[PDB]
Amino acid sequence: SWCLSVHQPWASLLVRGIKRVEGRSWYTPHRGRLWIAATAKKPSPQEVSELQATYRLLRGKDVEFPNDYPSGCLLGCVDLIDCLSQKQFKEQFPDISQESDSPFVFICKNPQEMVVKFPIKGNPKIWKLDSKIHQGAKKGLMKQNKA
Amino acid sequence: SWCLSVHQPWASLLVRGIKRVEGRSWYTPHRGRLWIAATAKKPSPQEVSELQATYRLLRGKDVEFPNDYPSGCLLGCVDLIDCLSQKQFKEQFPDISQESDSPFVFICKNPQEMVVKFPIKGNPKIWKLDSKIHQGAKKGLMKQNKA
DNA sequence: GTTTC
DNA sequence: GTTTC
């Protein structure tokens, strides 16, 4: 029931698990499940090319990118396990330390991506999902998980 | 008197010192001064964008790229101090290990860039500069160095 | 490699 | 944040 808005193409790289950390200028005390909504801003083909070229370097030529980078859309969720300073980030994750130069690095784990994505309007920083949106999206994910 | 042809935009990134290593599928025993010629293949604006975006990640937002990426051109030279396997590369250069995934990584140091660049036709692998080309280009660099 | 395509 | 511009 807490969500972070992110520009595409970064947003969909997060729920895919290709992008493993998210840099910001502010610290969050939030820990645990964090939904990811794409902002309304439409990514350009140049920005897609630039990001895909960057992650082909970081993850290798085999990386499979999202087919599409939808905007203004609830995409899925990550688990926010830590919010490190850049210093702690270079120390604790030395093999991916080049992946974020930001003052604070959001450590993302266990991503899940919604097959059916809901249109949504975001807010600054980390913001509250409506209970109905939350139950709906989480119900959709259970249909993706073994029951 | 030994030269390596490299596609742009990687070629100019090498003599600028922005790109610090050069990956290949083959090992060279060569050590020391290695000239860099851009191949004839003209780089597309998308490739420039993709590479510049990648190196803004690796070197930060302050990196200043070559104004132009001339093709089929003797650009300058690096010092080839070692030719590491990917294994040794990750061990010896853990702070930049993500910058090349190639089987062999050419460790480049002390780059120099010709202000006046000479048109040139390349050859495979590491090839011999003609003595007159070599003396011309090295004479141009001395004009760039303190005497 | 460059040039042709 | 979205929307306007």
Swiss-Prot record, chains A, B:
Record domain ASCH: where: 4-98
Subcellular localization(s) per the UniProt record: Nucleus; Cytoplasm, Cytosol; Cytoplasm, Cytoskeleton, Microtubule organizing center, Centrosome
Modifications after synthesis and translation: Phosphorylated by NEK6.
Residue ranges the record marks as coiled coil: none
Domain notes: The C4-type zinc finger mediates a competitive interaction with UFSP2 and ligand-bound nuclear receptors. It also mediates interaction with the transcriptional coactivators and the basal transcription machinery.
Associated pathology: Spinal muscular atrophy with congenital bone fractures 1: An autosomal recessive neuromuscular disorder characterized by prenatal-onset spinal muscular atrophy, multiple congenital contractures consistent with arthrogryposis multiplex congenita, respiratory distress, and congenital bone fractures. Muscular dystrophy, congenital, Davignon-Chauveau type: An autosomal recessive, severe congenital muscular dystrophy characterized by neonatal onset of muscle weakness predominantly involving axial muscles, life-threatening respiratory failure, skin abnormalities and joint hyperlaxity without contractures. Muscle biopsies show multi-minicores, caps and dystrophic lesions.
Subunit and interaction comment: Interacts with the thyroid hormone receptor/TR (via the ligand-binding domain); this interaction requires the presence of thyroid hormone. Interacts with the androgen receptor/AR; in an androgen, testosterone and dihydrotestosterone-dependent manner. Interacts with ESR1 (estrogen ligand-bound); competes with UFSP2. Interacts with UFSP2; competes with ligand-bound ESR1. Interacts with DDRGK1 and UFL1; the interaction with DDRGK1 is direct. Interacts with NCOA1. Interacts with EP300. Part of the ASC-1 complex, that contains TRIP4, ASCC1, ASCC2 and ASCC3.
Protein's job: Transcription coactivator which associates with nuclear receptors, transcriptional coactivators including EP300, CREBBP and NCOA1, and basal transcription factors like TBP and TFIIA to facilitate nuclear receptors-mediated transcription. May thereby play an important role in establishing distinct coactivator complexes under different cellular conditions. Plays a role in thyroid hormone receptor and estrogen receptor transactivation. Also involved in androgen receptor transactivation. Plays a pivotal role in the transactivation of NF-kappa-B, SRF and AP1.
Name of protein: Activating signal cointegrator 1
Segment of the intact protein contained: 435 to 580 of 581
